RNA sequence: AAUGGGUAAUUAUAGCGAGCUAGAAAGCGUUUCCG
RNA sequence: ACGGAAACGCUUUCUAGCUCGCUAUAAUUACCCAU
């Protein structure tokens, strides 16, 4: 049968995020690295490319034997999920990560929050002659909370090795939370976490019971 | 996994001063109890037109008086009858030791999130890991600086490798050494001090007029350190003996030629948080003093010694934690050495 | 008045305009104006700058209020760049601003005075 | 009135090479989120049918469905997609045919 | 000024009109301008090609008259690009911009700039 | 009159092809949506019209 | 000495700038009127 | 009493698949100035 399983989740920061554009028309002696942001409501965002980039390149590091050359090589428990171009059967993968928006932009004030994106003085120091060179790069503000919205896609092919699927992608977020979502984030920088995961689905009766115990284990 | 954590315990000594970049300048703060309170000024002139001051308050700002006292913020607002604040709420307590009470002026931001809080970002904790990391290993603290053009202070940066560089698997030993942000701590804990400049062949302190809104001592701020490979794993366990190296190497010269009266002990592992401190404790020390005593024919001229030892004054403090009550300072009238910070360093 | 078709050689002309040193012959031609307190007027409106590309204009009459009396303060004090500011018509650049567009003309002129500066000199 | 200055975003993304971890930057336009398209769906009703009208109105209401569920065009599995429909209402251009039980259908 | 017959043409001699590094030669003729000195204007004049497209030049000149300060700030600090829009002159080419065709012609002519740049390595 | 370069425009398109997947492009040209034809049909009275011209 | 003040730098630096698949594929090339 | 008359260049077809805006980087240095 077919299925659309839907894992909604929050994402809170820990440490600020800095997901990067770039804009060519920054002011002189303002912000030099801004965020992605949304172009009506000038929120931040977390576009769904940078989650599908490093879920995918964390969990090559556990789920790969003999190490990926190029992401063409992924050992087709995770070339399932995301989908190698070259291989004729998993092109077009079953995962489709949405961008998270925001939820708690109302929530961040009371707190008392000027912008939601703050900015950062950061200051290249040479260690020789401590001449320095500084930064001021956004960074999207530190209780922020983003909805993760991944979506599974069930088809004939899926069905007996579904679990399989859901303790990957469980163990994907666990292994990005011991991790940075994007940015600078050897120094802090995006520290991140999901919160209340809840897989439902909407579309096709599928049981989602069993496998939304295993979620919050 | 092989990410393998730490917790690096911060005991605050020394006050510490981090970034924000802008300054509050003079005019901006009134001292009306025994504390500064730093409105949002763009909402003080905002009751303050509705008062209908607005051209009083420009008048006052270009005016200065022969006295100091009479010519901050509490003195605009005790000639006009003033009473109420309701601005942008944030005051900090004076320590008595800032001085004439509260002719302060200009004083420096310390780095904020966007609730208000105070915190150390974990950028400014790697690199006070850094110059430790860059200055014990012999191989980092040979003949670098190359200079090659033009003027002599760049430094080799391509020396400690970085770059992703094609072919060649990609290793970055700093990427492997994520240092994250601390909790943000609170305002009560940040106490204002001055800046001051003890001189070597000349025994005066001299006070300058910076600032620098810094964190009390005995303060303890706790970092993470996920470390991924094992080379940059290992520098972190070890980073206990290498920062009593590194200080055993900057006791050596620029922290002999002072009475020891101003230098305290640390008993912990020490580390030196930066702002203050100085040119030594930023910087790998010997082509530092080369062509970082070049760098200055200016009024303000770095002279003829390494430095000029950079102290403040702040509330005296003791510990009592081990086998007797460490003074924490070992002078009277309450010179810290700007920057000093101890640690304690744990897996997991 | 500074228009978007204009407020570039305005500021141009406006750093040619501006005092030099007629003493200390070694390297003549250089300003009574450092760097750093013209950086200090680019700072201050650099946060404007910024935080009106996303705010409402309406959120901002605070500060813009505000800029009045830190551009006139910053001239109090070291009365050479109140020569600068009276030069490059700033106090009267700052009463036009009635919209988010001028307002970011404004900071343009400013990073075009700092542009400037470093070209000459 | 909501103040955009284009209708297309650029979203400037990378690639990082696994072994030697280098990044390879793109530029996509896309368009800006909460934008807004006439979408409009022809049905043509011939005299053979009989039964095949509403059996069809179905398959189309759930094929509305799944492209909210699935994505549109896009690079789907990395944002780009999610549309949604609203006012999903249809009137007989060409006319004598009744579309109240569909409009109620169409809720 | 650009002609559109000749300004790759202008772009490729202004290229090889960079004076090079004659210090070491470990890979000699390298140019003291970095590639992201000279990205960085790019990364300006092509997000005006793509806008010019759609827009309308009455509709872009805030960013165009920018595209005057930004210049002549990267060419303030370090003079590698103070050589640049001296051999390859910008300054010039940007007074006469009053055209949406001579708009384009400008961003691919900095395109041709740094294609040359990138082939001369 | 308003700027448009090319009385056609080229619509690129493709043909994912079901398991396998792969795509097929296509480069399929079209007129622009905003032009008008000069557009005429003649019609003819005679002696068998007369009845039914109205119709 | 006291008093009143801060001042001078650096404002990002070095890179990557898209890569590989697909590049059209199935059908219909005349039918009827006519001898 | 037009080598004519009748005859839609039309049907089907997602510009799609894979791809972290990443890498390194203490807002720091210097210590005075004027009467």
């Known amino acids: 049968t077919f299925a659309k399983i839907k894992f909604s989740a929050q994402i809170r920061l820990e440490t600020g995020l800095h997901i990067g554009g770039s804009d060519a028309f920054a002011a002189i002696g303002a912000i030099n690295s801004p965020v992605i942001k949304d172009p009506i409501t000038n929120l931040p965002i977390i576009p769904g490319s940078s989650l599908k980039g490093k879920m995918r390149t964390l969990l090559a590091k556990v789920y790969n034997e003999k190490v990926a050359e190029k992401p063409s090589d992924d050992s087709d428990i995770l070339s399932r999920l995301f989908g190698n171009s070259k291989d004729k059967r998993f092109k077009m993968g079953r995962l489709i990560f949405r961008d998270a928006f925001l939820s708690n932009a109302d929530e961040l004030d009371s707190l008392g929050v000027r912008s939601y994106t703050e900015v950062k003085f950061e200051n290249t120091i040479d260690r020789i002659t401590a001449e320095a060179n500084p930064r001021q790069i956004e960074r999207a503000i530190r209780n922020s909370t983003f909805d993760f919205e991944l979506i599974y896609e069930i088809t004939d092919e899926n069905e007996n090795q579904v679990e399989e699927d859901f303790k990957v992608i469980r163990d994907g977020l666990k292994l990005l939370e011991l991790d940075y979502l994007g940015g600078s984030g050897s120094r802090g920088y995006g520290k991140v976490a999901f919160e209340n995961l809840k897989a439902t689905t909407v579309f096709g009766n599928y049981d989602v019971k069993t496998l939304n115990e295993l979620l919050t284990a | 996994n092989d990410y393998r954590t730490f917790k690096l315990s911060l005991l605050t000594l020394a006050p510490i001063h981090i970034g924000n970049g802008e300054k509050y300048t003079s005019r901006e703060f009134i001292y009306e109890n025994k504390k500064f309170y730093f409105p949002d000024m763009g909402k003080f002139y905002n009751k303050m037109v509705e008062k209908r001051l607005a051209e009083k308050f420009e008048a006052f700002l270009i005016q200065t008086r022969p006295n100091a006292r009479n010519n901050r913020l509490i003195s605009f607002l005790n000639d006009n009858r003033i009473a109420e604040r309701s601005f942008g709420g944030y005051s900090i307590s004076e320590t008595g030791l800032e001085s004439s009470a509260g002719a302060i002026n200009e004083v420096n931001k310390f780095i904020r999130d966007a609730f208000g809080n105070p915190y150390i970002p974990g950028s400014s904790l790697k690199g006070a890991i850094r110059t430790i990391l860059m200055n014990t290993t012999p191989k980092w603290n040979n003949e670098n600086a190359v200079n090659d053009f033009g003027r002599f202070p760049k430094e080799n940066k391509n020396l400690i490798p970085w770059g992703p560089k094609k072919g060649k698997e990609y290793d970055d030993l700093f990427n492997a050494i994520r240092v994250s942000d601390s909790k943000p701590f609170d305002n009560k804990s940040l106490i204002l001090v001055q800046k001051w400049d003890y001189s070597a062949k000349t025994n005066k302190a001299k006070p300058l007029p910076l600032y620098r809104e810094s964190i009390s001592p005995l303060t303890k701020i706790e970092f993470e350190i996920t470390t991924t490979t094992d080379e940059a794993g290992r520098l972190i366990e070890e980073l206990g003996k290498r920062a009593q190296a590194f200080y055993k190497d900057y006791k050596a ?47 303000k001229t770095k002279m003829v010694k390494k430095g000029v030892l950079k102290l403040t004054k702040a509330p005296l403090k003791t510990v009592k934690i081990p086998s007797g009550n460490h003074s924490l300072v070992k002078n009277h009238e309450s010179f810290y050495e700007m920057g000093k910070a101890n640690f304690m360093i744990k897996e997991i | 008045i500074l228009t978007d078709e204009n407020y570039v050689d305005i500021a141009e002309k406006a750093i040619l305009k501006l005092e030099r040193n007629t003493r200390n012959r070694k390297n003549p031609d250089a300003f009574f104006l450092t760097t750093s307190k013209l950086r200090n007027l680019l700072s201050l409106t650099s946060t404007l700058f910024d935080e009106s590309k996303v705010k409402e204009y309406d959120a901002l009459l605070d500060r813009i209020a505000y800029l009045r009396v830190q551009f006139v303060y910053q001239a109090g004090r070291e009365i050479a760049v109140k020569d600068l500011i009276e030069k490059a018509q700033i106090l009267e650049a700052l009463k036009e601003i009635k919209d988010r567009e001028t307002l970011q003309r404004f900071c343009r002129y400013m990073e075009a005075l700092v542009a400037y500066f470093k070209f000459y000199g």
């Open chain 2, 253 to 299: 010269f620029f922290l002999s030629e002072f009475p020891d009266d101003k230098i305290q002990a640390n008993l912990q592992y020490p580390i030196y948080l930066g702002a203050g401190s100085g040119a030594w404790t930023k910087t790998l020390f010997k082509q530092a003093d080369g062509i970082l005593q070049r760098r200055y024919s200016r009024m």
